[PDB]
Write a protein that binds this ligand. Structure first.
Ligand SMILES: [Zn+2]
Lengths: 29, 21
């Protein structure tokens, strides 16, 4: 896997991919 | 949370997985 700062929509797409059918929760606050 | 962990610093694949359902 990439070794880097993942921010914004890049973070979200990383989650989408890694999580599969499980889905994810994105809570940045 | 996630921003501090994976944006502010860097996350391994395992750390990213903490945010899956
Ligand atoms: Zn970009």
């Amino acid at each position: 896997f990439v070794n880097q700062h993942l921010c914004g929509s890049h973070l979200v797409e990383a989650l989408y991919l890694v999580c599969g059918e499980r889905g994810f929760f994105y809570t940045p606050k | 949370g996630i921003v501090e962990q994976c944006c502010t610093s860097i996350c391994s694949l395992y750390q990213l997985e903490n945010y899956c359902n």
